[PDB]
């Protein structure tokens, strides 16, 4: 009797995927969840995670490759590997050369989730919902404060978005960009931000408790769908803003010390079945990386340009770079200062 341990993002599988795999294979699954790349990386670098499969973003897989925390995937144990789109594989390979360590899972963008009606009530019918101005212009956040503003608790995402908005390289390697203009803007915004959190914003958007959030696309579409299902009269939408946004792939990987590799390959091959991953996309409102699955994904998901954006929008997307340790120090210190920003001092 074997037991497979999986560590995935919250809100990132269909409700019946694991039970269906358990029923089919007889394998018992222990499924645990996270909402932060930094939490997962800390576990991978601190000791044994005890997990057989983990799901980093691709730039987090990249940065940990030479640490040897992952073992290469034996493709002979993944006969359904050919269902993955081979062009998407080439893009993922920028982070994982020759696709040796990672199985692409889902792809999306980091944009703005918002309450359509409350934004228009507060900012007017002309509210700049197609722009990062909605959430990064202080004059707008000051007005939105009471209806509730959330930022992701993701320093890399937040600084890269701010840098881009300020007309800098979103992956700037210049320390002064972080300590100066990016920090200046974030401190100006900070009094109007209710919280930094990377998962509470889904239900808060759905229930009308947060009016604007920096959010991951399919999480915001899940909020929208939860409100629709609740018949609660809340209208949530998502914007990939006109100034561009971050795009990313999340990938399954196998820790080098995984106990139950055979069961792990069984689960990956299960996810490679087109019906399995299409059903996941239908529930989580994210694009998968499986070419064979695409015709099976629901029309509502496939036809949503905030899930499958067209070429003119894709042209404005950027990807995360791994920063050197001096930028990492500057950025992380600045993030701690920003998040503590409301506190009173006596110096
Ligand atoms: C099936 O995933 C949606 C397609 O993803 C779009 C991004 C990842 O690719 C860019 C290239 C140009 N197509
Ligand atoms: Cl990524
Ligand atoms: Cl359909």
Numbering used by the authors: 29 to 375
Quote what the paper states about this structure:
Still, the protein-binding modes differ: PotF shows affinity for PUT and SPD, whereas PotD exclusively binds SPD.
We introduced the S247D exchange into PotF/D and into our high-affinity constructs E39D–Y87S–F88Y and E39D–F88A/L. The combination of S247D with the other constructs led to an affinity improvement with which the nanomolar range was reached for the first time, while keeping the order of affinities in the different mutants the same compared with the prior analysis. PotF/D–E39D–Y87S–F88Y–S247D is the construct with the highest SPD affinity (840 nM). In this structure, Y88 is stacking with N65 and the salt bridge residue R91, stabilizing the latter and thereby adopting the fully closed conformation. Furthermore, the hydroxyl group of Y88 is coordinated by E66, whereas R91 is interacting with S87 in two alternate conformations. Taken together, the interplay of the mentioned residues forms a tight pocket surrounding Y88, thereby stabilizing the distal region and supporting the completely closed conformation.
